[PDB]
C-alpha cells in the first residue's frame, strides 16, 4: 500500500464532498513529489499532504491511521524517509489558514499519549477526539471534519 | 529574469493626489503578494503596504501613518501592481519600490502567519510633495 | 521597534556580526537586506537562515532571544553597504517594521 494509494483514498471523500476539485489526489502527489512532507514525531513519523489552494473550494482535514509504517520524504532534508503512520491531508484555501492548521497539528503530534491513542483507536473514536479538539480552536472554526474524514489503510 | 518596473513618480504640491505603477513579468504575478516599500532620501527603508494573492484573499495591510490615504491594488490580468496616494504629504517624499513578497513559516518553531519577505525589488520610482 | 547599530566596521577577510534587536523577534523571523548606494536593497536572508540563489554562502541567518543576526565570513570590499533587518511587528505602525540600517565598513 503506497505513497499514491494513501493520498488517493484521503482525498476520496473530500472528492465526494466536492470540497476540492476532482484531480485533487493527482494535484498532492504532483506536489509532494516537488515539497515533501514527512515529519518525525518522537515515536511516529507524520505526513501533511497537501497542493495548492486554489485547487479547494472549502477547508476540510482528512486523517488516515496506517497499520504499518509507510516511507514519505522528509520535510526537512534528510537522507533517509521518515516511516509513516499518521497522516493528516489538509485541503485549506489560504496561505494563512494553512499556517493556522499546521500550527496546531504541530501540537497535537508532540502530544505523545494523543499521538499513542490515535495508534490505537477505532475510526469513530478518532473523530470524536480529533472534533473536539479542533472545536476548542476558534482559528480553525471554518475547517470541516466529517466521520467519514477518518480511516485506517493496509 | 523577474522585472518589476515603477513608474508615475514626480513632483506634486501637499494635499495632491498621485498614482503608482509597478508593471511585473518574469513570474506569476496571480500567485505573488506584492508590496510597496519606501525610502525617503538619505533615510532607511519603510514598509507602505502589501496586497496578498486573489487565492489568498487579495487583502490589504498599510501602515499607520499612510492609513486612509493610499490604497493598493491590482490588475492580474495586466500583470500591474499600483499605488493611489491621496492627500499627500511632505514627509511622504521618497523613492517607492514595489517588491515581489514570498512567505515562510517553519513547521517546528514557527509562529502563524509566519514571515514575509521582499525577494525581488524594481529601481524605484521618485515621489516629491512640495510646494 | 527593530533597534541596529548605526555603524559597524570589519578588517578585510574577517568576520562580522550585524545584529538586530526588538520584541518580535521572539516570535518571528527576520528577513535581511544589502544596500548599496544608488540601488535597490537585494534580499540576503530570509526565514531561519535561507539564501536566495547568487547569495554567497559568507551570509548567515541566526537568532537568540529577542535579537537577530546577520554573520558575514570574510568581509570584502564589495560587502560595504547598508544592512536592514525587517520583521513582523503586527501590534505597531507597521506591520511590517524595518531596523534603522547599519552601514559596514571595511578596513584594511
Known amino acids: 500500500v503506497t505513497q499514491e494509494d494513501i493520498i488517493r483514498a484521503l482525498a476520496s471523500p473530500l472528492i465526494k464532498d466536492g470540497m476540492v476539485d476532482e484531480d485533487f489526489a493527482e494535484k498532492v502527489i504532483e506536489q509532494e513529489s516537488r515539497y515533501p512532507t514527512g515529519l518525525q514525531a518522537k515515536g511516529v513519523g507524520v505526513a501533511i499532504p497537501h497542493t495548492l489552494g486554489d485547487y479547494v473550494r472549502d477547508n476540510a482535514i482528512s486523517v488516515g491511521i496506517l497499520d504499518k509504517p509507510v516511507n514519505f520524504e522528509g520535510w526537512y532534508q534528510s537522507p533517509d524517509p521518515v516511516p509513516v503512520r499518521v497522516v493528516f491531508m489538509l485541503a485549506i484555501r489560504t496561505w494563512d489558514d494553512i499556517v493556522n492548521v499546521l500550527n496546531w497539528i504541530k501540537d497535537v503530534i508532540l502530544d505523545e499519549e494523543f499521538m499513542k491513542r490515535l495508534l490505537t483507536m477505532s475510526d469513530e473514536e478518532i473523530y470524536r477526539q480529533i472534533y473536539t479538539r479542533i472545536s476548542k480552536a476558534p482559528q480553525l472554526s471554518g475547517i470541516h471534519f466529517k466521520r467519514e474524514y477518518v480511516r485506517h489503510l493496509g | 529574469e523577474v522585472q518589476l518596473v515603477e513608474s508615475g513618480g514626480g513632483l506634486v504640491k501637499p494635499g495632491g493626489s498621485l498614482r503608482l505603477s509597478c508593471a511585473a513579468s518574469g513570474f506569476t504575478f496571480s500567485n505573488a503578494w506584492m508590496s510597496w516599500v519606501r525610502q525617503a532620501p538619505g533615510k532607511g527603508l519603510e514598509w507602505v503596504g502589501r496586497?496578498?494573492?486573489?487565492?489568498?484573499?487579495?487583502?490589504?495591510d498599510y501602515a499607520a501613518p499612510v492609513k486612509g490615504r493610499f490604497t493598493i491594488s491590482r490588475d492580474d490580468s495586466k500583470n500591474t501592481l499600483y499605488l493611489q496616494m491621496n492627500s499627500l504629504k511632505t514627509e511622504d517624499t521618497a523613492v517607492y519600490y514595489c517588491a515581489r513578497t514570498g512567505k515562510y513559516y517553519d513547521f517546528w518553531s514557527g509562529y502563524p502567519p509566519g514571515e514575509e519577505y521582499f525577494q525581488d525589488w524594481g529601481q524605484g520610482t521618485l515621489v516629491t510633495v512640495s510646494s | 521597534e527593530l533597534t541596529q547599530d548605526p555603524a559597524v566596521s570589519v578588517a578585510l577577510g574577517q568576520t562580522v556580526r550585524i545584529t538586530c534587536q526588538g520584541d518580535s523577534l521572539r516570535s518571528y523571523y527576520a528577513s535581511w537586506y544589502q544596500q548599496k548606494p544608488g540601488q535597490a536593497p537585494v534580499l540576503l536572508i530570509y526565514?531561519?537562515?535561507n539564501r536566495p540563489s547568487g547569495v554567497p554562502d559568507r551570509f548567515s541567518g541566526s537568532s537568540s532571544g529577542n535579537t537577530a543576526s546577520l554573520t558575514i565570513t570574510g568581509a570584502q570590499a564589495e560587502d560595504e553597504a547598508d544592512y536592514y533587518c525587517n520583521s513582523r511587528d503586527s501590534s505597531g505602525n507597521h506591520l511590517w517594521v524595518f531596523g534603522g540600517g547599519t552601514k559596514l565598513t571595511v578596513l584594511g
Open positions: 526565514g531561519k537562515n
Open positions: 496586497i496578498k494573492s486573489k487565492t489568498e484573499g487579495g487583502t490589504t
